[PDB]
């Protein structure tokens, strides 16, 4: 009986941050394949329609939105081959239909993939997929990001004006029936993010007594645009739009899938206990604990080699520090 292989311990990596910062950003390319709907009659449906024109398009015109639609459409076709052509090796393309500002269907190809034999009995049974993916990124820049990948120079392109060299990232990977299904249902990343912010639109619409959607994003006659604490600038906080704060959560919800496993679940679960204890101090509800160091060991044993967990651990420590500074404003209240 061989010793079980344990997830090795890693350190923080900037490429996770960089992924976050870029996936959040806006583009000129709409990916989402959102189908038709029944005609609006009830004024609720008319508000629901308008609310979307702002909410959906804020996601649609972002990087994460396309990346999501890729994974879905790939995992869709990959599962279809895995059952249909079990015994056959098949060359599956990484397709994605995109629409520009002018409104033209640009069919994209991010590379070619190869699915091995797929006699998948159990749900957890693995089918090895081999990925060949195009990229403008030189792997020598951040060497420690690509231990798993094998890269060839395969030409160049003048996308901007500078001769940007095209690479080919080649990797032996693996998926199973479950992951391929959960991949097809990754569109539901929209709902988790859209509800959370529609709630804040409703909350504010209550107070002003009209649809505060248009007002929250850009602003109107009376009301200025909503702004959120969003990121840092060499150790000093920065504010950002409602539109960005929407996308930052949508990205997070996609990363929850893309880096979804037992390590993330265990962390997410135990880290809430601490997130609440922090909210207690922020509310000044004098919170008490019975064994903190034990409650920490629960959170810390979930950090091994999940990029999102390791970066979330950092971000949490960063956010904790900022909230720890804000506390100093309260401790000196009602003590004259």
């Amino acid at each position: 009986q061989e010793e079980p292989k344990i997830p090795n311990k890693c350190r923080v990596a900037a490429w996770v941050q960089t992924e976050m910062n870029l996936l959040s950003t806006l583009t000129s390319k709409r990916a989402l394949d959102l189908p038709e709907i029944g005609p609006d009659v009830a004024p609720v449906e008319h508000v629901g329609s308008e609310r979307r024109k702002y909410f959906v398009n804020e996601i649609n015109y972002c990087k994460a939105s396309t990346v999501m639609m890729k994974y879905v459409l790939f995992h869709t076709s990959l599962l279809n081959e895995s059952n249909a052509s079990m015994g056959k090796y098949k060359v599956i393309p990484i397709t994605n239909r995109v629409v520009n500002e002018k409104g033209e269907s640009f069919d994209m190809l991010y590379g070619l993939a190869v699915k091995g034999q797929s006699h998948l009995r159990g749900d957890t049974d693995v089918v090895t997929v081999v990925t060949f993916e195009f990229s403008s990124t030189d792997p020598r820049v951040d060497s420690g990001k690509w231990p798993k990948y094998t890269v060839f120079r395969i030409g160049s392109l003048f996308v901007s004006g500078r001769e940007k060299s095209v690479y080919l990232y080649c990797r032996v990977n693996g998926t199973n029936k479950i992951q391929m299904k959960w991949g097809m249902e990754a569109r539901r990343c929209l709902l988790q993010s859209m509800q959370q912010m529609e709630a804040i639109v409703e909350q504010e619409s209550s107070i002003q007594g009209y649809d505060m959607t248009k007002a929250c994003f850009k602003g109107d006659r009376v009301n200025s645009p909503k702004t959120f604490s969003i990121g840092t600038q060499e150790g000093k906080l920065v504010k950002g739009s409602f539109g960005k704060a929407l996308r930052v959560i949508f990205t997070k919800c996609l990363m929850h899938y893309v880096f979804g496993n037992a390590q993330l679940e265990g962390f997410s679960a135990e880290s809430r206990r601490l997130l609440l204890l922090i909210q207690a101090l922020k509310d000044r509800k004098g919170p008490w604990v019975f064994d903190l160091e034990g409650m920490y060991s629960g959170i810390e044993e979930c950090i091994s080699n999940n990029p999102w967990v390791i970066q979330s651990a950092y971000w949490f420590n960063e956010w904790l520090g900022f909230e720890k500074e804000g506390s100093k404003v309260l401790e000196s209240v009602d003590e004259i």
């Binding site: 806006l26 702002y54 398009n57 804020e58 015109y61 972002c62 739009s241 539109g243 960005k244």
Partner: peptide, 7 residues
């Protein structure tokens, strides 16, 4: 119709 912006 809406069209988002950023810094």
């Amino acid at each position: 119709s809406y069209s988002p912006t950023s810094p």
